[PDB]
Amino acid sequence: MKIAIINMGNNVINFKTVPSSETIYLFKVISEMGLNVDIISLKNGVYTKSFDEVDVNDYDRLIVVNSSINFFGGKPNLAILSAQKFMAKYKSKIYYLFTDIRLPFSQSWPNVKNRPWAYLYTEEELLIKSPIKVISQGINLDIAKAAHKKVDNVIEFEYFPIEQYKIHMNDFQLSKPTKKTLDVIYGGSFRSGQRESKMVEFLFDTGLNIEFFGNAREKQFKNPKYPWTKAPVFTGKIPMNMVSEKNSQAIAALIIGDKNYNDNFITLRVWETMASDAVMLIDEEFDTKHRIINDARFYVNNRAELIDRVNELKHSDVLRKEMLSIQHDILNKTRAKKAEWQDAFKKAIDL
Numbered sequence: 305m306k307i308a309i310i311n312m313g314n315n316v317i318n319f320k321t322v323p324s325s326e327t328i329y330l331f332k333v334i335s336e337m338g339l340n341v342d343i344i345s346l347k348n349g350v351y352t353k354s355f356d357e358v359d360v361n362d363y364d365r366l367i368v369v370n371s372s373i374n375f376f377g378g379k380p381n382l383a384i385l386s387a388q389k390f391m392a393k394y395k396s397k398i399y400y401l402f403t404d405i406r407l408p409f410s411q412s413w414p415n416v417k418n419r420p421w422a423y424l425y426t427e428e429e430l431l432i433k434s435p436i437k438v439i440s441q442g443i444n445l446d447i448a449k450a451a452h453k454k455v456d457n458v459i460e461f462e463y464f465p466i467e468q469y470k471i472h473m474n475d476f477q478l479s480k481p482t483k484k485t486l487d488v489i490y491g492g493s494f495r496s497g498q499r500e501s502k503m504v505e506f507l508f509d510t511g512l513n514i515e516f517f518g519n520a521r522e523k524q525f526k527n528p529k530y531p532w533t534k535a536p537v538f539t540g541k542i543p544m545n546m547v548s549e550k551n552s553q554a555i556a557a558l559i560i561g562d563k564n565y566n567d568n569f570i571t572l573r574v575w576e577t578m579a580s581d582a583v584m585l586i587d588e589e590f591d592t593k594h595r596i597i598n599d600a601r602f603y604v605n606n607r608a609e610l611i612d613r614v615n616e617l618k619h620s621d622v623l624r625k626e627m628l629s630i631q632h633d634i635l636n637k638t639r640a641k642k643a644e645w646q647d648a649f650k651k652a653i654d655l
């Protein structure tokens with residue numbers, strides 16, 4: 305049993321980029337599961353083999369991490385093109401890891417064919433005809449199915465909390481008490497504006513010392529529907545393996561998501577935040593049934609409630625420590641089900 309895992313549109317090398325990091329982490333957690341897996345990318349490296357040095361059909365299972373297939377500047381993107389050529393040659397079922405609602409499986413050929421450089425490729429080369437099974441991080445498969453409505457070869461859907469790899473990794477550990485320099489923190493990208501209203505609501509004009517780290521930039525928030533005066537402080541992006549340490553500099557860390565994530569997707573930040581030294585504060589709409597932690601003190605409905613909660617946390621060190629103790633225990637509750645999680649993944653990829 306040999307498994308191949310690839311990222312459909314991003315080069316994989318190290319932990320300097322998020323897509324590369326997620327791919328390596330998945331490779332690691334699958335390996336720690338007792339499975340023989342290889343990461344196939346553009347070049348041979350510390351964690352990878354190149355597309356050229358291997359035969360896709362030498363593998364028994366092909367796993368693909370979701371990604372956009374958009375061509376920046378309209379120019380060829382070898383990460384995208386090489387990955388799909390690899391996939392198109394595979395003669396068995398493909399397992400697509402759907403971790404981001406905006407990145408459902410999509411065919412590059414329909415786009416490439418109209419490009420002025422189309423002559424460089426053919427339909428037979430890029431068109432992926434193998435049947436595809438979507439492994440949805442979201443529990444709502446109707447939403448997963450609707451997202452893949454344009455690709456008829458995606459004929460199977462199954463829910464699996466992919467993002468838990470963060471807590472099941474053999475090297476995982478909870479963050480230690482950290483000196484506080486911030487009131488609230490949130491790390492992420494602008495996600496093409498899909499979450500602008502929520503970002504402005506909880507991170508702007510709060511009167512608190514808030515930091516927004518990651519790819520996002522202040523100038524991207526210009527939608528007239530979500531105006532603001534005082535923005536949080538934007539700092540550069542950091543490696544994925546340094547995220548919890550970063551969250552730990554703040555008294556609290558925000559949990560928000562895209563509209564389609566509400567009561568559907570549990571995201572990486574949920575675990576990265578819960579494991580940190582920052583109290584997890586969740587937007588009520590993101591988890592209305594409080595399935596993350598059955599304690600209302602971890603939830604906020606709007607900007608005003610977030611500010612009030614942070615003031616309480618700043619006022620009572622006892623409250624802050626209690627809540628940290630609670631979220632750490634709750635996280636460990638899920639870690640205790642590692643064996644089941646591992647078995648569910650194997651079942652997901654027909655093992």
Ligand SMILES: O=c1ccn([C@@H]2O[C@H](COP(=O)(O)OP(=O)(O)O)[C@@H](O)[C@H]2O)c(=O)[nH]1
Binds near residue numbers: 322495541
């Ligand atoms: O500087 C940064 C900011 C974010 N992240 C990662 O990016 C994720 C957030 O991704 P996204 O912005 O798409 O938001 P989500 O939809 O995951 O909430 C975080 O959980 C981290 O794992 C990172 O590695 N470095």
